[PDB]
Amino acid sequence: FIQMSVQRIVEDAPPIDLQAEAQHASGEVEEPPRYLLKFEQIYLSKPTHWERDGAPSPMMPNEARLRNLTYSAPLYVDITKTVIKEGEEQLQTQHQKT
Amino acid sequence: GPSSQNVTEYVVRVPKNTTKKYNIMAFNAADKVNFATWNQARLERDLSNKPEDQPWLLRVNGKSGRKFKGIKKGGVTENTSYYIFTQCPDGAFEAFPVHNWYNFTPLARHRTLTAEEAEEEWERRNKVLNHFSIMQQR
Amino acid sequence: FHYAGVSAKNVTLGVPRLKELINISKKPKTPSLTVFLLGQSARDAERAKDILCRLEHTTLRKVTANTAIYYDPNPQSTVVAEDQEWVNVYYEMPDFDVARISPWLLRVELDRKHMTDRKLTMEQIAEKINAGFGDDLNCIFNDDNAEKLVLRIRIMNSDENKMQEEEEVVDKMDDDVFLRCIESNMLTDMTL
Amino acid sequence: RDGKLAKPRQLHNTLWGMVCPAETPEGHAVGLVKNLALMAYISVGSQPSPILEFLEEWSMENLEEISPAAIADATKIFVNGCWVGIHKDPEQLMNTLRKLRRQMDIIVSEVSMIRDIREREIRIYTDAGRICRPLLIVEKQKLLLKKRHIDQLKEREYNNYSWQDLVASGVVEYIDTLEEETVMLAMTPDDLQEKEVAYCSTYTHCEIHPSMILGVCASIIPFPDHNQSPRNTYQSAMGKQAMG
Amino acid sequence: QEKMATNTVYVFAKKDSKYAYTGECRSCLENSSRPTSTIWVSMLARGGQGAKKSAIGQRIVATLPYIKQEVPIIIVFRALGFVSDRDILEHIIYDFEDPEMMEMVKPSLDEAFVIQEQNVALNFIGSRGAKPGVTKEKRIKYAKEVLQKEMLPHVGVSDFCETKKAYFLGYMVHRLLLAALGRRELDDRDHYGNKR
Amino acid sequence: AERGELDLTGAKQNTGVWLVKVPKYLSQQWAKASGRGEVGKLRIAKTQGRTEVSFTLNEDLANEHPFVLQSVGGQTLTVFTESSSDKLSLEGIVVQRAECRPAASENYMRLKRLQIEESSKPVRLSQQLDKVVTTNYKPVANHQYNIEYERKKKEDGKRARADKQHVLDMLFSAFEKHQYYNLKDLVDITKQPVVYLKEILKEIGVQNVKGIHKNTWELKPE
Amino acid sequence: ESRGFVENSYLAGLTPTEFFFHAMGGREGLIDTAVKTAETGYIQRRLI
């Protein structure tokens, strides 16, 4: 499930694109702006916990019992931002890891 | 036999290009269509869908001489490609790729039962007893 | 249900009947009735069976071996050649109004095993059918000594106005369908 | 929940080797609550499509490529409820799939393959949530295992000889209830191999040990069969109630 | 948690109601959502009427997703576009040589003639779906979407897999038909192989 | 001569064609056809009670495939074409169908390898990440807001009213296209405060709800 | 045995199959007991 299923959902239909309103009469602005979002591999950190100083530490399941913390790990993803901006600058891509 | 004695050998080529896409046009044997009766035919993509995906519309012997609708098969090269093998004057064989599979079926002419003027209502009243008279009243 | 008692397991035991009884349901989940027999019936099985035949529910569908619908050009020169002498021999039947009755033939086959089963006769059957459907249904049958019990029927097309008199564009009743409406009704409705 | 009244609980026979009959709470949830068998296993789900492609190659006719009426004779084969096709010779196909199944080139732990002559059908399922268990594979009314293989199991304590290799050995296979309907299961290697009183010798597979039906709790009490059956369920509950 | 196996058509008696027999199959997607896609084919036993047709008890009557009421299986076949009875029969059985199977289906054939056109059939199914005004493009278009996606998703929602979809329904009816005829044994609910 | 016109020549010639099913790996070998497109040679042996056809790969293409003949009965098959000039033509009717199958050259292992070889993918499985902490930089001010700022500083909507005239002239232009317009749309042509605009629309016009609630304005019919 | 006959004794022990059929009936007694236990409280209330 961790290995594939969540990823299959991530494989499924996360790509979305959005186009700005035309806002008629503006002038000769060639057409309303447009934005697209793209996703790749999903990443998972080993179980870890962030101490009040903002810093990370390893999540010992023994520690989880003592501090009554929930045993968990960080989940990470490859994200891409992708502009069919409906302008002259089509195919301009911007990468995120979120 | 010669179908039970003849032994021959011919060369096969598979050209990386063609001057025209090759498709299959399939007919039900049960109809036993006499192709000789086809003096002419028209062939156009179907207009219900208002291109390469479009079903074909075949009009033979005029607009209403003969008419069929061809519907694309789900797949053609999903596991195995289909080839057209043709005999050449040099005896060698030439192979042609099948681009698509279209299913062709026969199509009744004029008749027209609207089934919307009162027939949808009439069915509610239906006792299975009459059916012809509505067809004249139109 | 530890109870055997050479019989069916009736009056479902205990609490569900007790719960139902407390609930005073309009009808028992398992209704039952004990039939006692006066005089000889208490000692004569044959008398008790005669009561059994009289009491017991019998549907027409229970009685029929088979049914079939035929196109018969002539009631006496029937296409059912096996029945042909059987129809042909009959003549004392008013065959003057049969010259217009349903050209279509409907024929039913009857279970002689059923006749053994409930101890029944053909004359009882013919008289039952006519009484229910009225005079409008013609009814004829072979004797029990035949190769098989069959009953072939006709609609009583009384010569006169039953001939597109008012043309009323409704089609009062098609034949073919009407053999089925009667047969649908014949099996399902009649309790012999 | 859905579908209620006139359905109750008692027991189903196929549960044999799938769930311990004694391992249930004595509360109202009795029988309503079940427990995993000692050696039962659950399907995780796989994709038949790569296997399905070889099938097309093994020569399995497509649904839109043939007319059902034109192929009245061939056995129909089903995968995950889906009608993949038909095969004019199912028996080699069943034998070949099983030998691939026995070769571990087909996942015994997942792939179920069942044929009904009565229906003229072959159904296959590779979906998740299916229960399967390992069984001894009987061939020619005899066990497929060798005593030398036991020595290999002994070799595993020091060096290596994995249970998976034993699975890879194909002398034992993992088996669901659908497959059980068709197999001729043996109770014991010894007695059943006897021909002197062989009412049947068509046995196909054999139990590792009848105790494998048992659950965690039932496994604790000795000779449960010399004891009244519910007492064991009471023990199964009360065992859970014990301090320790 | 114990559940019933999906994508597996089962027949159970519904004799506790007006329905003589029932065939059910859920057609949830393999991964996409598993919507359930519960399908009921129920055999209705209003084994009589009056003087209308003497035989209503042979009318099955499919239970379609989201539709406000039940409709005959055969109407769906018209929506599938198989106007020729021979083609539907192959879809039902590759071997119609048994007159008994032929006679049992015959009363459903009588239903088929009230609507022959696929387009009318789609609007009909749509009209049963809802009332998007007189715009019978929408009822057809909606029917088209249900036929693709909402109906038997488990085989594929692709357009060309509609004909392919049709092939499963007839076996499903056939399986129902054998059990309704009695040639098939009644499926167990207690069986775990029929469960997940 | 028309686009939708289909040539029937092949059919009317009763032209016959052959149909052969071929595996993809072989077909992939065939996309690398030797020379112009030659892939090999076909061998046909017929006897009094047995007929054998096979194909042998070109020696170049190599760096025996028996045929299984299949029926074409039950369904009449013909081939129809679409040229690169989009002209349509019927080449012929299918007189034979066949399938290329392996024979005494493989059991399963290579095919398994071939299947594996075709794939060459991680199926999509989540292969770790192992562990990272890609914390995100604080930009002291919202970037888009900042981007908004470069644009914002260029021009303001706070413009001047030297127009108790240029705006009415523009009104004739708009209302010439339609009798009535929405207030926001009236605001779009203008570059002045709505309250001031409200003062103008009151001056030469009235307004409506137009049966749509919206404050829609129009020029005075009187 | 194919239909649940337990031929052996508690002293003799039970076959794997007989034990299962024996376990099944034990459920029938136990389920009936649990159901009977809840219902008597309710029926009585109706009675009282």
Q: Which residues in D lie closer than 8 A to residue E168 (C-beta atoms)?
A: 82-83
Identity at A6, one-letter amino acid code: V
* 67-126 of B, contacting D, C-beta below 8 A: 73-74, 79-80
First vs last C-alpha separation in chain D: 37
**Token pair for E182:** 């009695």
Q: Which residues in D lie closer than 8 A to residue E191 (C-beta atoms)?
A: 12, 14, 177
Comparing C-alpha atoms, which of C92, C62, C91, C61 is closest to residue C77?
Answer: C91
**If interface means Cβ-Cβ distance under 8 Å, which residues of chain D face chain G?**
8-11, 16, 21-22, 24, 26-28, 30-31, 187, 207, 210, 213, 223-230, 232-233
Identity at B43, one-letter amino acid code: L
Task: Assign B27 to helix, strand or coil.
Answer: strand
**Token pair for D171:** 């002398």
- CA B28 – CA B104 distance, rounded (Å): 8
Identity at C103, one-letter amino acid code: P
Q: Which helix (H) or strand (E) holds A41?
A: strand A34-44
- Per the annotation, binding residues of D for RNA are 241
Residue D203 burial (CB count, 10 A) = 22
- Domains in chain E with CATH codes: 10-196 (3.90.1110.10)
| F102: nearest CA partner in chain D | D57
Number of domains in chain B: 1
> How far are the Cα atoms of C70, C86, C106 from residue C80, in angstroms, in the given order?
8, 10, 11
Comparing C-alpha atoms, which of F74, E82, E74, B70 is closest to residue D67?
Answer: F74
Q: Which residues in D lie closer than 8 A to residue F23 (C-beta atoms)?
A: 57
Label residue A91 exposed, middle or buried (CB < 10 Å: 0-12, 13-18, 19+).
exposed
Buried b (16+ CB within 10 A) or exposed e, C126-145: eebbeeebeeebbbbbbeee
- C-alpha torsion angle, residues E162, E163, E169, E174 (rounded to 10): 180
- CA A11 – CA E104 distance, rounded (Å): 48
Identity at E124, one-letter amino acid code: F
- CA E73 – CA E43 distance, rounded (Å): 11
Residue D223 burial (CB count, 10 A) = 9
CB neighbour list of residue A24: distance below 8 Å, 6 or more residues apart = F188
- CA A11 – CA F124 distance, rounded (Å): 8
Name the DSSP letter for residue B77.
S
Label residue D37 exposed, middle or buried (CB < 10 Å: 0-12, 13-18, 19+).
buried
User: Largest alpha-carbon pair distance within chain G?
Assistant: 50
Specify the residue for token string 């030439």: B94
**Token pair for E10:** 């089962």
- CA E149 – CA E158 distance, rounded (Å): 8
Residue D207 burial (CB count, 10 A) = 20
* Residues B84/B22, Cβ–Cβ less than 8 Å: yes
CB neighbour list of residue E105: distance below 8 Å, 6 or more residues apart = E89, E92, E177
* Residues F194/F217, Cβ–Cβ less than 8 Å: no
Domain that holds residue F175: 156-218
A11 touches chain F (CB under 8 A): yes
Residue D174 burial (CB count, 10 A) = 20
CB neighbour list of residue D122: distance below 8 Å, 6 or more residues apart = D75, D76, D77, D78, D87, D90, D93, D94, D113, D114, D115, D116
* Residues E186/E10, Cβ–Cβ less than 8 Å: no
Specify the residue for token string 């199914």: E125
Task: Assign B67 to helix, strand or coil.
Answer: strand
> How far are the Cα atoms of C25, D71, E76, E84, E86 from residue E95, in angstroms, in the given order?
51, 10, 22, 16, 11
Domain of F171: which CATH number?
Answer: 1.10.10.10
Comparing C-alpha atoms, which of C134, C70, C139, C146 is closest to residue C103?
Answer: C70
> How far are the Cα atoms of A73, F70, F80 from residue B70, in angstroms, in the given order?
56, 24, 12
- CA B103 – CA B70 distance, rounded (Å): 5
**Token pair for F37:** 């497109």
- CA D149 – CA G3 distance, rounded (Å): 38
Rounded to 5 degrees, φ, ψ at D235 are -60, -40
Label residue F96 exposed, middle or buried (CB < 10 Å: 0-12, 13-18, 19+).
middle
C169 touches chain B (CB under 8 A): yes
- CA A98 – CA B20 distance, rounded (Å): 50
**Token pair for D90:** 């199912």
Interface size, chain B vs chain E, as Cβ–Cβ contacts under 8 Å: 27
Residue E114 burial (CB count, 10 A) = 20
Name the DSSP letter for residue C119.
T
Tell me, in Å, the resolution of the deposited structure.
5.4
| D118: nearest CA partner in chain E | E184
> How far are the Cα atoms of B81, C114, C124, C179 from residue C186, in angstroms, in the given order?
62, 17, 15, 10
- CA D230 – CA D15 distance, rounded (Å): 18
Would you say how long chain B is, in residues?
A: 138
Long-range contacts of B89-92 (CB under 8 A, 24+ apart): B91/B8, B91/B10, B91/B11, B92/B10, B92/B11, B92/B12, B92/B13
Minimal CA separation from C175 to chain E, in Å: 12
- CA E196 – CA D177 distance, rounded (Å): 12
Residue B51 burial (CB count, 10 A) = 5
Residue B15 burial (CB count, 10 A) = 14
Cα angle, residue E114 at apex, residues E112 and E116 outer, rounded to 5°: 65
Identity at F102, one-letter amino acid code: P
Domain that holds residue B22: 1-138
- CA E19 – CA E59 distance, rounded (Å): 10
Task: Assign E110 to helix, strand or coil.
Answer: helix
Cα angle, residue D143 at apex, residues D138 and D144 outer, rounded to 5°: 90
The sign one gets for the Cα dihedral E60, E61, E64, E69 is negative
Specify the residue for token string 């299986």: E73
* Residues F95/F18, Cβ–Cβ less than 8 Å: yes
Comparing C-alpha atoms, which of C11, D12, F105, F129 is closest to residue A97?
Answer: F129
Are F and G touching by the rule of 3+ CB pairs within 8 Å?
no
Task: Assign A9 to helix, strand or coil.
Answer: helix
* Residues E150/E165, Cβ–Cβ less than 8 Å: no
Secondary structure (DSSP) of E126-188: HHHH---TT-HHHHHHHHHHIIIIISSGGG---TTHHHHHHHHHHHHHHHHHHHHHTSSPPPP
The sign one gets for the Cα dihedral D232, D236, D241, E2 is negative
How many distinct helices (H) and strands (E) make up chain B?
2, 8
F22 touches chain B (CB under 8 A): yes
- Domains in chain C with CATH codes: 47-189 (3.30.1360.140)
Side-chain-facing half-sphere of D81: CA atoms under 13 Å: 25
Q: Give strand pairing partners of F31.
A: none
What's the 3-state SS for chain F?
CCCCEEECHHHHCCCEEEEEEEEHHHHHHHCCCECCCEEEEEEEEEECCEEEEEEEECCCCCCCEEEEEECCCCEEEEEEEEECCCCEEEEEEEEEEEEECCCCCCCCHHHHHHHHHHHCCCCCCCCCCCCCCCCCCCCCCCHHHHHHHHHHHHCCCCCCCCCCCHHHHHHHHHHCCCCEEEHHHHHHHCCCCHHHHHHHHHHHEEEECCCCCCCEEEECCC
Comparing C-alpha atoms, which of A25, A63, A31 is closest to residue A47?
Answer: A63
- CA E102 – CA E99 distance, rounded (Å): 5
Buried b (16+ CB within 10 A) or exposed e, A44-80: bbebebeeeeeeeeebeeeeeeeeeeeeeebebbbee
D194 touches chain F (CB under 8 A): no
Identity at F104, one-letter amino acid code: A
Residue C74 burial (CB count, 10 A) = 14
| D53: nearest CA partner in chain F | F115
- CA B14 – CA F30 distance, rounded (Å): 7
- Per the annotation, binding residues of F for DNA are 211, 213
- CA C192 – CA C117 distance, rounded (Å): 14
- CA F56 – CA B9 distance, rounded (Å): 11
* Residues C71/C104, Cβ–Cβ less than 8 Å: yes
**Token pair for B87:** 């005999």
Label residue B58 exposed, middle or buried (CB < 10 Å: 0-12, 13-18, 19+).
buried
Q: Give strand pairing partners of D173.
A: D135
Comparing C-alpha atoms, which of D20, D72, F96 is closest to residue E95?
Answer: D72
- CA E126 – CA C63 distance, rounded (Å): 46
- CA C100 – CA C154 distance, rounded (Å): 10
Q: Which helix (H) or strand (E) holds C15?
A: helix C15-22
Cα angle, residue B2 at apex, residues B1 and B7 outer, rounded to 5°: 145
Would you say how long chain G is, in residues?
A: 48
- CA F143 – CA F121 distance, rounded (Å): 39
* Residues F23/F100, Cβ–Cβ less than 8 Å: yes
**Token pair for D193:** 């191999």
- CA E142 – CA E152 distance, rounded (Å): 15
- C-alpha torsion angle, residues D232, D235, D239, D240 (rounded to 10): 90
> How far are the Cα atoms of E4, E35, E121 from residue E150, in angstroms, in the given order?
20, 9, 17
Residue D89 burial (CB count, 10 A) = 13
- CA C50 – CA C29 distance, rounded (Å): 29
Specify the residue for token string 């199991």: D153
- CA E90 – CA E169 distance, rounded (Å): 12
Task: Assign C29 to helix, strand or coil.
Answer: coil
CB neighbour list of residue C105: distance below 8 Å, 6 or more residues apart = C69, C70, C71, C72, C75, C78, C79, C80, C152, C153, C154
* Residues F92/F11, Cβ–Cβ less than 8 Å: yes
Q: Which helix (H) or strand (E) holds C21?
A: helix C15-22
Using CB atoms, which chains have 3+ pairs under 8 A with D? B, E, F, G
> How far are the Cα atoms of C105, D104, E58, E108 from residue E55, in angstroms, in the given order?
19, 56, 7, 11
Cα angle, residue A87 at apex, residues A83 and A91 outer, rounded to 5°: 35
Identity at F26, one-letter amino acid code: L
Out of B73, B116, B127, whose CB is closest to E160?
A: B73
Rounded to 5 degrees, φ, ψ at F36 are -60, -35
Tell me the H-state helices in B14-137: 119-125, 133-137
The sign one gets for the Cα dihedral B10, B12, B13, B14 is positive
- CA D31 – CA D28 distance, rounded (Å): 9
- CA C187 – CA C110 distance, rounded (Å): 12
Tell me the H-state helices in chain A: 5-12, 61-66
Q: Which residues in F lie closer than 8 A to residue B25 (C-beta atoms)?
A: 77-80, 90
Secondary structure (DSSP) of D103-171: TTSS-TTT-EEEEETTTTEEEEE--TT-EEEEEEEEETTEE---HHHHHHHHHHHHS---HHHHHHHTS
